[PDB]
Design a protein around this ligand. Sequence first.
Ligand SMILES: CC(=O)N[C@@H]1[C@@H](O[C@@H]2O[C@H](CO)[C@H](O)[C@H](O)[C@H]2O)[C@H](O)[C@@H](CO)O[C@@H]1O
Ligand SMILES: CC(=O)N[C@@H]1[C@@H](O[C@@H]2O[C@H](CO)[C@H](O)[C@H](O)[C@H]2O)[C@H](O)[C@@H](CO)O[C@@H]1O
Ligand SMILES: CC(=O)N[C@@H]1[C@@H](O[C@@H]2O[C@H](CO)[C@H](O)[C@H](O)[C@H]2O)[C@H](O)[C@@H](CO)O[C@@H]1O
Ligand SMILES: CC(=O)N[C@@H]1[C@@H](O[C@@H]2O[C@H](CO)[C@H](O)[C@H](O)[C@H]2O)[C@H](O)[C@@H](CO)O[C@@H]1O
Lengths: 142, 142, 142, 142
Amino acid sequence: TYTISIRVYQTTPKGFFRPVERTNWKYANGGTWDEVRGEYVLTMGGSGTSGSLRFVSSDTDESFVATFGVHNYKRWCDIVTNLTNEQTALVINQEYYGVPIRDQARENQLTSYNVANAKGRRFAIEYTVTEGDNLKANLIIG
Amino acid sequence: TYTISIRVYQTTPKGFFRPVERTNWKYANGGTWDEVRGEYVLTMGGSGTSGSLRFVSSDTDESFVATFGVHNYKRWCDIVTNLTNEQTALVINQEYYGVPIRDQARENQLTSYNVANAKGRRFAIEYTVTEGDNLKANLIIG
Amino acid sequence: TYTISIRVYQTTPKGFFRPVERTNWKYANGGTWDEVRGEYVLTMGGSGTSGSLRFVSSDTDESFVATFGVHNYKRWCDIVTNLTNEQTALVINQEYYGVPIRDQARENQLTSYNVANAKGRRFAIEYTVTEGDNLKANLIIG
Amino acid sequence: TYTISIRVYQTTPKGFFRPVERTNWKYANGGTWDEVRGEYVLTMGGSGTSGSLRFVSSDTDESFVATFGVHNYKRWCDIVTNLTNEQTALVINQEYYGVPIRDQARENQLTSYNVANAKGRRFAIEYTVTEGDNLKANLIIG
Ligand SMILES: CC(=O)N[C@@H]1[C@@H](O[C@@H]2O[C@H](CO)[C@H](O)[C@H](O)[C@H]2O)[C@H](O)[C@@H](CO)O[C@@H]1O
Ligand SMILES: CC(=O)N[C@@H]1[C@@H](O[C@@H]2O[C@H](CO)[C@H](O)[C@H](O)[C@H]2O)[C@H](O)[C@@H](CO)O[C@@H]1O
Ligand SMILES: CC(=O)N[C@@H]1[C@@H](O[C@@H]2O[C@H](CO)[C@H](O)[C@H](O)[C@H]2O)[C@H](O)[C@@H](CO)O[C@@H]1O
Ligand SMILES: CC(=O)N[C@@H]1[C@@H](O[C@@H]2O[C@H](CO)[C@H](O)[C@H](O)[C@H]2O)[C@H](O)[C@@H](CO)O[C@@H]1O
C-alpha cells in the first residue's frame, strides 16, 4: 500500500484554479482519493497504478490534469495542459497505459516535473518525500 | 449546459461510506464536479455525457459507483455495486459508452434506480427535479 | 493529544442539513477541526476543551449545534437545537464553560445523547469508541 | 443579506497552511460558512456581523486568523497572527466586538490588509469586489 499526499499551492492571484475531477486507474487493486488535513491523498493497492486530478480556472479559460503514481516501485508524475474539452482526467489518466508519449512520462519515474500552457503559465509537481510507502508532493500553480 | 446537484443521505450507522472518486466522461464538451453547499454538482457542456461518484466503506468491505448524466436530453442514472478492485469510477463511467449491459441502463433515462449488494444493503438514486437544465437528485445509502 | 472523529449520518431524505460552522474552545492549548477521509476530526491539546459543529437545513428552517469534548479525561457531548439566529456554534461552544445547564451537560461525560427540535426531528451523538486518545462518534440526523 | 466569497492563494511551498476553524459572529441574524466551487462563502443576515477563518501550518509552527465582515454597510477585514494556543478563531472573532484594538480594525472598513508574523511571512486580504451585497476577496498566504 502506497499513499501520495498532495499539497496544492496557487501562487498568483491571477485567475483561480478549482478542483473538478479525481480519478483512479485500475491496476494494482486500484486506489482511492481522500481529502486529509487539507491535502489530496491518493492511496494505491500496490505498485503499477496512478490517480489524476483536474483543475479548472474558468476566469481565464485554463486547466490542467496532474497525474501521480508508482511505476516499478518508483513514484512518477506528469502534467497535461492545453486541454480540449474532451480531455477530462478520466481520459488523461488512462493514456499513461497505452499511449507511447504518456507511457514514457510514467517510465521516467520523475520526482519533479513542469509544463507551461499556451498562455505562459507554468505548473509543477515536486515530490518532497520521494521514497517509502507514504510519499508527499507539492502541486504548484504558477 | 446541464447541472445535476446531488444530496447524499447516508442512512445507516452500520459501516461508513466515504467519497473516493469523481469522474467526467468526455462527450458533450465534457463536464466538471463541484462541491456546493454540501452537495455534489455535476456540470456538463450538453447532452450525451455523464459523471460518476464512487463511495467505499472500508469497515465493511462495501463500495458502489453512482452515475448521473443526460442522454438524448433526458436525465439518466445507474448504480453499480459488488465491485472488484479493478472497477474504479474511471472504469465504470466509461463502460456506459460501449458496454451493452451499461449502455442499456443509460438509454433507460431513469428518474430513479435502486439496487442491493450481496450483503443486502440498498442504494438508491431519486431525481427530485426531472426536467430542465438544472436537475436535482438524492443519493440514498441504505 | 485527543482526536474525536465524527461520521455524519443523514437518515431521511426530508430536508437537507449542510455544515456551516466549526469552532474550537480555548482551554487545554485549544484544538483544530480537520476533514479526514469523509469525517470531521476534532484534535485537542489535552483534556478540558471541546469543539462544535453547526448544521443547517434551509429547506425546512432547521438547525443544530453538536459539541464534542473531553472533561476530566472522559469524553462528553451535547446537541442544542431550536436555535435562534443569534445561536451560532461560536456562541454555543462557549456556553459549556459558564452556563450552569450547559456546564452540567459537559459534566455528564455522556457516550451518547439525543434531543428533538420543535418540529419533531431527533438528533443524536453516539460514541463508538469511548476510551483512549482516538475517539470516534456517529452524528445521526433523524 | 450579504455574501463574501473568498479565494485562498497559498503562494509559498515552504510550510503548509490548512483550514482548521470557521466561526460566525451572532449579530445581524448571524451567518454561515459554505464551500462553493473551491471558495469559502460567508453569508450574513445583515450588516454588523462577521466570520473568521483560522489556518495552521504544523510543519513550521505558524498560524493566523482571517476575519471578514460588514460594518455600517461597508465591508471590513483583519488578520491576526503570532497566535497563542488559546487564540482560536472562536476567541478572535468575538474580540472584534468588545476589545478596543480589534474594534478599531473593524471600524476601519478596509478593502485590503496585510501583516507579517515574527518569522517574516506575509498574509494579505484583498477585496476584489468592494461594493454591493455580494463581495469578493482574495486571501493570500505569502
Ligand atoms: C510492479 C509494477 O509497478 N508493475 C507495473 C505493472 O503494474 C501491474 O499491472 C498488472 C496488470 O497489468 C496488475 O494490475 C498488477 O497488480 C500491477 O502491479 C503495469 O502493468 C506496467 C505498465 O504496463 O508497468 C509495470 O510493469
Ligand atoms: C444529444 C445526445 O444526447 N446525444 C448522445 C451522444 O452524445 C454526443 O456524442 C458526441 C460524440 O459521439 C459528442 O460528444 C456530442 O457532443 C454529444 O452530444 C452519445 O454519443 C450517444 C451515446 O450512445 O448517445 C446520444 O446519441
Ligand atoms: C483535566 C480537565 O479536563 N480539566 C478541566 C479544565 O480544563 C483545563 O482548563 C484550564 C484553564 O481553566 C487549562 O486550559 C487546562 O489546560 C485545561 O486542562 C476546565 O477548565 C474545567 C471546566 O471549568 O473542567 C476540568 O477541570
Ligand atoms: C448596521 C450595522 O452595521 N450596525 C452595527 C451593529 O450591528 C447590529 O448589532 C445589533 C446588536 O447590537 C444587531 O445584531 C443588529 O442586527 C446589527 O445590525 C454592531 O452592534 C456595532 C458593533 O460596534 O456596529 C454597528 O453599529
